[PDB]
Amino acid sequence: PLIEEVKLAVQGLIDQQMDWNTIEKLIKSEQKKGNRIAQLLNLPLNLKQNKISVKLDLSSNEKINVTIDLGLSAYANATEYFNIKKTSAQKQKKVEKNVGKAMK
Amino acid sequence: SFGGINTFQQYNTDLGLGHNGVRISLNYFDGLPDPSLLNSLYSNELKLIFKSLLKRDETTKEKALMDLSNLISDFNQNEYFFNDIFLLCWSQIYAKLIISDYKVIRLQSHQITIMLVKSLRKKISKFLKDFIPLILLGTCELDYSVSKPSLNELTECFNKDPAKINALWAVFQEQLLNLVKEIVVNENEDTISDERYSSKEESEFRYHRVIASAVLLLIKLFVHNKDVSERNSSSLKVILSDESIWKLLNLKNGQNTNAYETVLRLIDVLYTRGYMPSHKNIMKLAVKKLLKSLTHITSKNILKVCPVLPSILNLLATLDDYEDGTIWSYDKSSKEKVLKFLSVSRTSPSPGFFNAVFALYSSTKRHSFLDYYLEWLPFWQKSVQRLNEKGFSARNSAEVLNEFWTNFLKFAEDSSEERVKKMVESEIFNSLSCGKSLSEYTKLNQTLSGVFPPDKWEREIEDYFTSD
Amino acid sequence: MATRTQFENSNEIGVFSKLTNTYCLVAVGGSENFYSAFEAELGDAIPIVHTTIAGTRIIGRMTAGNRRGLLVPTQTTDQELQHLRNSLPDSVKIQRVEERLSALGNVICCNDYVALVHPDIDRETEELISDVLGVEVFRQTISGNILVGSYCSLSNQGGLVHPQTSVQDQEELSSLLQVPLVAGTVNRGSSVVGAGMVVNDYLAVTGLDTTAPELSVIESIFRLQ
Amino acid sequence: IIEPSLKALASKYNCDKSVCRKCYARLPPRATNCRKRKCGHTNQLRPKKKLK
Amino acid sequence: SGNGAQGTKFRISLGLPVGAIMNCADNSGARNLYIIAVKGSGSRLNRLPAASLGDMVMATVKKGKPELRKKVMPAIVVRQAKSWRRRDGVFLYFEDNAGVIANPKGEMKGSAITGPVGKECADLWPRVASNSGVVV
RNA sequence: UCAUCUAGACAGCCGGACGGUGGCCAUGGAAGUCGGAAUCCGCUAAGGAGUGUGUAACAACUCACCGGCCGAAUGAACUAG
RNA sequence: GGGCGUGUGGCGUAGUCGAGCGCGCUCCCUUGCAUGGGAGAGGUCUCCGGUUCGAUUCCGGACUCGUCCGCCA
Ligand SMILES: [Mg+2]
Ligand SMILES: [Zn+2]
């Protein structure tokens, strides 16, 4: 849900037809003034590919940086990361089928 | 027509300058009018005016302001147009406009707000708290052209009553202070001006001009309100502590010493109030910066910095009195800085420079800051020699020489030594004799009324006739 | 203010306009923004005259102006001369110049007190300048640039000169004119500063492509704050 | 932004059409054949390409 | 002319066809300009594209400094020497053909112009009028 | 050549379009609708272990089926003048 | 214009889908009519896509080079 709040915030700033660098400066100023929604964001924004990046706590003090598409839901981005996981497994099985004949 | 939501702003809940529920701020990125309010405006014409004001290009902004003014001028037909919604939106945009580089934008915006106050009197009461501080900041802007018209209009708005103008300073003083704090502490050069469209310099220049206005306002606020220090001490401390006001005291670079002068006035005013004595840290920070400024003056910039020098010395003399020359004690190398400053300063003399130097001497003599014979006299003698060679080429020459003599004569009196007496006589003779046309300038001769006993001067005239 | 203005796209305002303390001259074929800049900034105290000199839209390079007097070339017609006589105040004197170089804005760089001219002007024209303008005259070149009007912008407070100017020439000209001079550029690096902009005691008007450091140099040297 | 209902009303006439693949004619959205003679009233139609 | 024109120009009698060599009036170190093209000229069978006063041309430096030779550059005609009529009906002409060097936007490569220039050229190009000594 | 048809057909409106059951595998999830197989009953006038939209999965909407109005022919595929 | 083939380290050159040698010179050792020896550096295998598990290697396209054939009275 908090990722959806961050997305709604960035999309509301986008829908004002505001300049991207002014949006990044607004994120920096609100991070300095201690807004949580701003402080969850990482500043090199990929608005050219409609993608933001967000910091999530690994343990419920280390934070991980995850890229979120603005045109899909947060659950839909999670399903994309699951899909990239699932495609990686099939290539690994193809490698395991390769190993014996290749090394022979 | 207008789309989007300022979701980030809702969380912050800081209205900056504004007290009516809309954030009003100088920085370009935020404080922009919310899209929903913009749609709520009464007429389409007004909405278009707002979009144009938002656009960066100046010709477009100016055209929109001209249109808005025309609408306000025809107030009777358009009274419905200007509502609370218009005023809330205007207040947010006005703040950005007053910091604009272009003077016309600044002037027009100020004129427009004043017109609104006159026309909508008693209905802008809710918004007076937001508008009045900004209007005043404009009236205390270094440029004469923006300030003078704005003040005249304000006076006219209040029916030419001096009391009302003074009252305004008293009534919104807390708010006026908040504006100053925001410029000095909250803002930075980058926040005020966009980096992409401006250089490292210029951005600095702009910030400095805006901050100077804030300081001028602060000085005015202090003069107008006697009790300001006591009521707003916490706010005052934060503004004063920040180095931004003090960074203005740099003479190495910068177009004018006018901003630097404004800071000097503030330090003096604070000392008169006793705030500087009361708070030691603020005073020490200010003093050290002032000492650094003395080093900045150099041969290359001496012509540029000459008007400000009499003022600098005068402030130093007043500060020295505090704490028995405590100000010199703060810096280990202060004496060296002063000596260097004096050496650079003597080469170019500006009106009133000598009086300042004597004042410094008067404060320092009790505590022996400068050796009278080993250190001070050399300074005096060299000075007269310099004055004579470029003499009276200059205009104030007559006034400048007169000053030297009056001051030197006083300095000499506190010697009780032969060398000083000898120097005075010899120098006087040289100054009159090589001269230029000292007698010819009657004023110069009058101002320099005499330097010695009357009968002896006659004996010397006798020698000139007796000479080969 | 150094006011950003174009003449229909042209960033050279000194070519199409002549600004003094007492009056202003603008070309007849001008845009609404170009007229509105002078009308807003100058106000109603100072007359603005829409004029044509010798049948040409260029008026700043054709004429040399002062608060006491105005100089016009020989090719200026009687209708234009009478219109300038009616539109201008009674204080200024308008006198035709009969001289071969004939482009007085290029030839003459002048202010209220002191003037720089082309070295090769005629002595009658020099005496005519000294009579009508009441201005002391020096024949000098700015680092070998004979067109001192095109290559210098001058006012009472200060002056802007050509960027590629020798420093020795800078203190020589500064001592000769009794004003401080700065070498600088206008209109995104254009060398012709006098053709680039017009200035007086309280106003400077320049092209839109004049950058912010250049505008800061302008307001610093002309003390417009 | 126009308005959502007003964008719907304008897109009813400007965007919710079909295009004949042979002669590029702008056609009713529920049409089955092109109304033009030059393509021979063909039934090769496609939806008009939307944005987004 | 074309792009850098400040206004329009009345028709001046064309005096400089392709292949004409004119004097190089400015101080850029070039001695003559050789006209190879006229900007804005029309198309007719066998007709040479000709230039008049105030026109922008494409030219090569045939004689001058070697860093200016052997390349094409824009030029502006400032003296025509073929007599043309104004709308006040005087027929006038200079005694030589002369032009200056410029970029495609029209600002001069040089800095000063020797000799007279025409007012029909000075009105149309402001940089030429800026660096021009005398305008007739 | 197949089908439907005064025991009410095809268009157009309006209403329902349900339970066992989130049927079995498989997935971090997939409940009619990512797929693999099966694809059966009840209540019925009638409703697919689903025609699409559809959500992370739901939820929701619509279908092909049955009903009121209409009262009479109509739908699909193909052939050749 | 078209066809056919070609492209490897600073240079030349070997490549079956699983980049070596020689020459230039980096260092060290070694000595007239100046050698030899030993460890070195050196590639986006012309480039871009697909196949494979991995392409110098297979395929498609582009660039480049080298050959061959081409107008009229
Ligand atoms: Mg031919
Ligand atoms: Zn068709």
Swiss-Prot record, chain A:
Subunit-structure text: Component of the ribosome quality control complex (RQC), composed of the E3 ubiquitin ligase RKR1/LTN1, RQC1 and RQC2, as well as CDC48 and its ubiquitin-binding cofactors associated with the 60S ribosomal subunit. RQC2 binds to the 40S-binding surface of tRNAs.
Subcellular location: Cytoplasm
Parent sequence residues shown: 397 to 544 of 1038
Lineage summary: Eukaryota, Fungi, Dikarya, Ascomycota, Saccharomycotina
Family (UniProt): Belongs to the NEMF family.
Note: Present with 7700 molecules/cell in log phase SD medium.
Protein name, per record: Ribosome quality control complex subunit 2
UniProt function note: Key component of the ribosome quality control complex (RQC), a ribosome-associated complex that mediates the extraction of incompletely synthesized nascent chains from stalled ribosomes as well as their ubiquitin-mediated proteasomal degradation. Thereby, frees 60S subunit ribosomes from the stalled translation complex and prevents the accumulation of nascent polypeptide chains that are potentially toxic for the cell.
Curated annotation (Swiss-Prot), chain C:
Organism domain of life: Eukaryota
Signal peptide: none
UniProt xrefs under InterPro entries: eIF6 (IPR002769)
Gene Ontology molecular function terms on file: ribosomal large subunit binding; translation initiation factor activity
Post-translational modification: Phosphorylation at Ser-174 and Ser-175 promotes nuclear export.
Record keywords: Cytoplasm, Initiation factor, Nucleus, Phosphoprotein, Protein biosynthesis, Ribosome biogenesis
Annotated compartments: Cytoplasm; Nucleus, Nucleolus
Modified residues (Phosphoserine): 174-175
GO cellular component, one term: cytosol
Primary location: cytoplasm
GO-annotated biological processes: assembly of large subunit precursor of preribosome; cytosolic ribosome assembly; maturation of 5.8S rRNA; maturation of 5.8S rRNA from tricistronic rRNA transcript (SSU-rRNA, 5.8S rRNA, LSU-rRNA); maturation of LSU-rRNA; maturation of LSU-rRNA from tricistronic rRNA transcript (SSU-rRNA, 5.8S rRNA, LSU-rRNA); ribosomal large subunit biogenesis; ribosomal subunit export from nucleus
Biological function: Binds to the 60S ribosomal subunit and prevents its association with the 40S ribosomal subunit to form the 80S initiation complex in the cytoplasm. Is also involved in ribosome biogenesis. Associates with pre-60S subunits in the nucleus and is involved in its nuclear export. Cytoplasmic release of TIF6 from 60S subunits and nuclear relocalization is promoted by the GTPase RIA1/EFL1 and by SDO1. Also required for pre-rRNA processing.
Extra remark beyond the main annotation: Present with 18600 molecules/cell in log phase SD medium.
Subunit structure comment from the entry: Monomer. Associates with the 60S ribosomal subunit.
Gene: TIF6
Curated annotation (Swiss-Prot), chain D:
Cross-link (Glycyl lysine isopeptide (Lys-Gly) (interchain with G-Cter in ubiquitin)): 17
Signal peptide: none
Localisation per UniProt entry: Cytoplasm
Membrane-crossing segments per the record: none
Quaternary state and interactors: Component of the large ribosomal subunit (LSU). Mature yeast ribosomes consist of a small (40S) and a large (60S) subunit. The 40S small subunit contains 1 molecule of ribosomal RNA (18S rRNA) and 33 different proteins (encoded by 57 genes). The large 60S subunit contains 3 rRNA molecules (25S, 5.8S and 5S rRNA) and 46 different proteins (encoded by 81 genes).
Role summary: Component of the ribosome, a large ribonucleoprotein complex responsible for the synthesis of proteins in the cell. The small ribosomal subunit (SSU) binds messenger RNAs (mRNAs) and translates the encoded message by selecting cognate aminoacyl-transfer RNA (tRNA) molecules. The large subunit (LSU) contains the ribosomal catalytic site termed the peptidyl transferase center (PTC), which catalyzes the formation of peptide bonds, thereby polymerizing the amino acids delivered by tRNAs into a polypeptide chain.
Protein name according to UniProt: Large ribosomal subunit protein eL40A
Organism: Saccharomyces cerevisiae (strain ATCC 204508 / S288c) (Baker's yeast)
UniProtKB/Swiss-Prot annotation, chain E:
Location of the protein in the cell: Cytoplasm
Keywords attached to this entry: Acetylation, Cytoplasm, Methylation, Ribonucleoprotein, Ribosomal protein
Broad class of the protein's primary localization: cytoplasm
Gene3D superfamilies assigned to the protein according to its UniProt record, in alphabetical order: Ribosomal protein L14
Modification N6,N6-dimethyllysine, positions: 105, 109
Cited PROSITE patterns: RIBOSOMAL_L14
GO function term, MF aspect, one: large ribosomal subunit rRNA binding
Keyword set includes Cell membrane: no
UniProt cross-references to SMART domains, sorted A to Z: Ribosomal_L14 (SM01374)
Pfam (any one): Ribosomal_L14
Keyword Repressor annotated: no
Free-text description of this protein's post-translational modifications in UniProt: Methylated by RKM1 at 2 different sites, but it is unclear which are the 2 methylated residues among Lys-39, Lys-105 and/or Lys-109.
PTM-bearing positions, type N-acetylserine: 1
GO CC, alphabetical: cytosol; cytosolic large ribosomal subunit
Swiss-Prot/TrEMBL GO biological process terms: cytoplasmic translation
Function: Component of the ribosome, a large ribonucleoprotein complex responsible for the synthesis of proteins in the cell. The small ribosomal subunit (SSU) binds messenger RNAs (mRNAs) and translates the encoded message by selecting cognate aminoacyl-transfer RNA (tRNA) molecules. The large subunit (LSU) contains the ribosomal catalytic site termed the peptidyl transferase center (PTC), which catalyzes the formation of peptide bonds, thereby polymerizing the amino acids delivered by tRNAs into a polypeptide chain.
Homology family: Belongs to the universal ribosomal protein uL14 family.
Additional note from the record: There are 2 genes for uL14 in yeast.
Protein name: Large ribosomal subunit protein uL14A
Organism of origin: Saccharomyces cerevisiae (strain ATCC 204508 / S288c)
Originating gene: RPL23A
